[PDB]
Design a protein around this ligand. Structure first.
Ligand SMILES: CCCCCCCCOCCOCCOCCOCCO
Ligand SMILES: CCCCCCCCOCCOCCOCCOCCO
Length: 252
């Protein structure tokens, strides 16, 4: 079968502040896909330093079935969160892993309408007292896709993320987030434009909205780039900007 490879890089900025460079490489053959990525997050002014962390990751995806009427796959993943704390009590480092098992599906309802989504089951282990994370988490984004034509499609999804603790007497990091996410994927030749919105339904930890715009360009020579902006707020204003480059090449 054909070996499909991808290599890429991204640089994101989240300021209310954070600089986040990352790279990745993935290979696919038949129903299998293996992805490796490295992500780092720290203050934009780390030069002045402060707490930061890196996030190596290995994911494997398997496609059980891929037909027009029904498609389903599964991804297994592992990540380590390497924290480096600055000017804070306790040890200055911590390592917490995240194990992920997540099915994804796409089911045809009509020639124009589809029901798709994914669901991730997570386990977090080690240094959770320092880290503050709940040891268990479930997340899901599932919904409907109405396709106008090859150029436009509408997607409206329900989103849920929640943290639980298997450890009966520990309530650290527990939370619940529910949202409605709408996207309007536009494909224009080599251009890709996807304006989207996140409508907060409710969230509690221990109304929030976001509007954004994704843009991607494909040079059709294996190279593609992307730019994206997002604005989130409560009453709490946050800004997000990101740029990326991907190079696609196959085998056989
Ligand atoms: C095969 C191509 C790899 C493409 C680069 C992706 C980056 C992969 O991870 C590098 C690991 O970064 C350093 C940390 O020490 C390793 C910890 O174990 C993490 C599991 O991947
Ligand atoms: C930038 C996105 C443009 C895409 C437009 C498609 C809009 C489609 O309809 C979305 C309708 O759903 C709205 C949100 O859910 C209701 C909110 O919850 C109620 C009270 O908080």
């Amino acid at each position: 079968n054909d070996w499909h490879f991808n290599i890429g890089a991204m640089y994101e900025i989240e300021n209310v502040g954070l600089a986040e460079p990352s790279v990745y490489f993935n290979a696919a053959n038949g129903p299998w896909r293996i992805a490796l990525a490295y992500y780092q997050e720290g203050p934009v002014d780390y030069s002045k330093r402060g707490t930061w962390f890196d996030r190596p990751e290995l994911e494997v995806h398997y496609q059980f079935l891929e037909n027009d009427d029904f498609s389903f796959g599964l991804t297994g993943g592992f990540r380590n969160y390497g924290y480096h704390y600055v000017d804070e009590p306790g040890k200055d480092t911590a390592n917490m892993q995240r194990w992920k098992i997540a099915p994804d599906w796409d089911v045809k309802l009509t020639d124009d309408l589809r029901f798709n989504g994914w669901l991730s089951m997570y386990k977090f282990a080690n240094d959770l007292n320092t880290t503050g994370y709940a040891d268990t988490r479930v997340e899901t984004e599932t919904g409907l896709q109405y396709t106008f034509n090859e150029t436009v499609a509408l997607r409206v999804n329900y989103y849920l993320e929640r943290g639980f603790n298997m450890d009966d007497s520990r309530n650290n990091g527990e939370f619940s987030t529910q949202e409605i996410r709408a996207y309007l994927p536009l494909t224009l030749g080599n251009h890709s434009v996807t304006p989207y919105t996140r409508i907060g339904l409710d969230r509690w930890s221990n109304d929030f909205n976001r509007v954004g715009l994704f843009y991607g360009y494909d040079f059709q020579n294996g190279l593609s780039v992307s730019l994206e902006y997002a604005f989130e707020w409560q009453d709490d204003k946050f800004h997000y900007a990101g740029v990326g480059v991907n190079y696609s090449f196959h085998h056989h």
